[PDB]
Amino acid sequence: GSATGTGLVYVDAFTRFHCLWDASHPECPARVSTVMEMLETEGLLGRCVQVEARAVTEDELLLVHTKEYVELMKSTQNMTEEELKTLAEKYDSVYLHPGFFSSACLSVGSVLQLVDKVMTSQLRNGFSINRPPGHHAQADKMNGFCMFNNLAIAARYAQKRHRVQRVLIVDWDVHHGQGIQYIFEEDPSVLYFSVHRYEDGSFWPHLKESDSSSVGSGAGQGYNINLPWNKVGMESGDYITAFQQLLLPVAYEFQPQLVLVAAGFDAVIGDPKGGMQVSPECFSILTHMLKGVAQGRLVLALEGGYNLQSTAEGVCASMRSLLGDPCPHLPSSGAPCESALKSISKTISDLYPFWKSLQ
Ligand SMILES: CC(C)[C@H](C(=O)Nc1ccc(C(=O)NO)cc1)c1ccccc1
Ligand SMILES: [K+]
Numbered sequence: 001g002s003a004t005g006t007g008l009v010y011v012d013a014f015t016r017f018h019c020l021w022d023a024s025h026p027e028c029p030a031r032v033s034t035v036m037e038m039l040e041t042e043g044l045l046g047r048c049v050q051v052e053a054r055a056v057t058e059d060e061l062l063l064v065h066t067k068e069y070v071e072l073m074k075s076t077q078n079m080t081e082e083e084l085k086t087l088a089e090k091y092d093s094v095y096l097h098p099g100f101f102s103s104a105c106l107s108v109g110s111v112l113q114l115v116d117k118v119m120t121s122q123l124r125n126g127f128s129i130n131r132p133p134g135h136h137a138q139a140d141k142m143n144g145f146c147m148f149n150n151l152a153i154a155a156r157y158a159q160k161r162h163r164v165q166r167v168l169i170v171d172w173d174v175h176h177g178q179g180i181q182y183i184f185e186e187d188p189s190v191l192y193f194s195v196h197r198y199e200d201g202s203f204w205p206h207l208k209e210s211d212s213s214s215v216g217s218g219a220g221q222g223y224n225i226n227l228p229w230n231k232v233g234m235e236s237g238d239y240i241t242a243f244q245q246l247l248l249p250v251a252y253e254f255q256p257q258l259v260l261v262a263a264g265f266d267a268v269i270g271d272p273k274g275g276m277q278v279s280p281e282c283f284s285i286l287t288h289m290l291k292g293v294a295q296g297r298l299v300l301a302l303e304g305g306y307n308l309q310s311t312a313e314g315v316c317a318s319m320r321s322l323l324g325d326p327c328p329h330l331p332s333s334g335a336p337c338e339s340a341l342k343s344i345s346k347t348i349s350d351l352y353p354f355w356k357s358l359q
């Protein structure tokens with residue numbers, strides 16, 4: 001395929017690691033194989049341009065991560081199960097496996113491949129069907145099922161290799177991507193928007209900096225936007241309203257040259273962790289709402305999502321929009337609930353001093 005195409009990256013290596021000490025761990029290889037099977041069954045896979053993965057290089061990793069941390073992660077490939085468990089336990093909410101590092105390197109590289117093809121007009125947009133996820137990973141630590149911060153690396157790579165000046169990262173996973181926030185906290189060239197379950201800190205990762213008062217600092221003040229949900233059960237209308245009132249006006253003002261999406265599907269109805277009630281079809285609309293900016297240069301990368309069917313359906317819905325199919329009518333009312341409106345209004349109050357579009 002070519003310029004007006006939608007890229008897809010998937011490699012069998014993404015199934016080559018799993019939790020050795022918890023057979024019920026939610027972050028498991030079926031997450032990606034099920035997505036690929038549904039894309040095929042739906043006839044969507046054959047409409048995409050198959051893009052090869054590549055392994056990230058050390059220098060690419062060092063755009064975000066420390067040399068000491070990269071070397072330590074590299075060494076996990078030669079550690080016994082006991083050593084892997086001891087190291088994993090020094091971080092919050094991670095496991096390790098002898099194949100984790102190799103898959104993590106292909107996970108980062110998959111996004112870089114799509115950035116290359118989108119930025120050079122060889123594709124319109126794309127989706128990497130990758131695990132492990134990335135948005136919690138930090139400069140010198142694993143966190144939240146993540147080793148390397150796929151999208152943070154991709155953003156800095158777009159700036160370094162393709163000389164992009166402004167990148168928008170949209171994170172619709174149900175969890176706050178605090179790793180992305182930290183990496184870009186002082187950086188006005190990367191705008192980070194996250195909508196996430198918070199419940200006044202009750203929900204993991206339990207961080208005060210996941211609240212909307214965290215707007216970035218220094219030159220980056222105004223370029224970090226958190227939308228915390230404080231009740232479970234949010235629906236499509238809550239997300240669409242947030243995008244319409246808050247994200248889209250800011251995004252147009254920011255004028256990004258590339259949009260990267262932390263495309264988790266743990267907010268979809270049925271997810272065992274997220275507690276939300278978003279229909280998979282909503283993600284067709286959310287994807288569509290991001291395509292009118294950055295010349296449509298839009299790259300999605302899989303983050304969380306743990307109900308195999310719900311996550312596969314959410315990926316398929318997003319892919320239909322990437323491919324240009326007209327959006328479905330959504331049955332649920334587009335009106336947001338009172339709690340969602342309260343969070344949106346609060347985030348707007350915290351960000352209005354930095355965005356003319358919010359005044
Ligand atoms: C104890 C509990 C708090 C922990 C957990 O839920 N973690 C977690 C972190 C990140 C994501 C995600 O999807 N981020 O995008 C999802 C889940 C956990 C760990 C192991 C097995 C089950 C549960
Ligand atoms: K999020």
Ligand SMILES: [K+]
Pocket residue numbers: 184185186187188189190191192216220223224
């Ligand atoms: K930022």
Ligand SMILES: [Zn+2]
Pocket residue numbers: 173174175264266303304305
């Ligand atoms: Zn998540």
